[PDB]
Amino acid sequence: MVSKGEELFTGVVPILVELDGDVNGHKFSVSGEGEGDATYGKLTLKFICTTGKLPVPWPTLVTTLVQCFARYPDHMKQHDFFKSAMPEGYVQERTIFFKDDGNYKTRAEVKFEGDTLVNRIELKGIDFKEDGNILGHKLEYNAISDNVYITADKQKNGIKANFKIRHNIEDGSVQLADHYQQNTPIGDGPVLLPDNHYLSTQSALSKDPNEKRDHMVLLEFVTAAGIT
Ligand SMILES: [Mg+2]
Numbered sequence: 259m260v261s262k263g264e265e266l267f268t269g270v271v272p273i274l275v276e277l278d279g280d281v282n283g284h285k286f287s288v289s290g291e292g293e294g295d296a297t298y299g300k301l302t303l304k305f306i307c308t309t310g311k312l313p314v315p316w317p318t319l320v321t322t323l324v325q326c327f328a329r330y331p332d333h334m335k336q337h338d339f340f341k342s343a344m345p346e347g348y349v350q351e352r353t354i355f356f357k358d359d360g361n362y363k364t365r366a367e368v369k370f371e372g373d374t375l376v377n378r379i380e381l382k383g384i385d386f387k388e389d390g391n392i393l394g395h396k397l398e399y400n401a402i403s404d405n406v407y408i409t410a411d412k413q414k415n416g417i418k419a420n421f422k423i424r425h426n427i428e429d430g431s432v433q434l435a436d437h438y439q440q441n442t443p444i445g446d447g448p449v450l451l452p453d454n455h456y457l458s459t460q461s462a463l464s465k466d467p468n469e470k471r472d473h474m475v476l477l478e479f480v481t482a483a484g485i486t
Contacts, residue, residue: 264344267327281383286313320402343445409452
């Protein structure tokens with residue numbers, strides 16, 4: 259048996275994302291739309307900065323901008339917290355430490371609004387260097403990929419995760435972003451508390467040749483692994 263929430267993901271699901279951000283006082287908003295097909299761990303999304311120019315690099319916002327779309331192998335379906343929390347949803351919180359630079363703190367609510375999966379986020383960044391790789395826009399517009407390591411957090415009826423993102427700098431070096439994550443259900447029903455495992459995630463970044471607004475197109479694959 260799969261969670262009741264998992265039943266909501268058997269087809270292609272529309273996705274909406276809304277983010278309000280403030281990084282060193284630079285305020286901005288992002289809207290996104292697309293679709294997810296969890297059977298294949300597959301997402302296609304387009305994001306637009308609705309306030310003008312984005313004041314940080316797009317790659318630094320990818321992880322913030324719906325892990326309920328992960329493909330869990332049949333043998334791992336009892337470990338999918340994210341879908342189990344649906345439709346009422348979950349809160350996803352992170353702190354993201356950019357090595358030798360500032361940090362993002364994020365709080366999001368991910369839930370269904372009818373048949374649409376919605377991710378609403380607030381992001382606050384502090385302590386960035388004005389001429390660092392973030393505020394100085396020194397990060398290449400490059401894919402990110404890595405493993406999200408998940409553990410249960412029984413005391414909050416949820417999960418924690420940690421991972422690293424190695425962003426390529428234009429000079430050939432690396433800007434590390436150390437992620438710390440916690441997710442807690444919004445509803446009061448039972449959820450699936452997992453054994454340790456990870457999400458293997460790959461995000462490909464591109465541009466819409468017809469789009470003049472500041473934007474990001476993503477094609478992403480997310481697959482659970484690490485058990486059997
Ligand atoms: Mg301070």
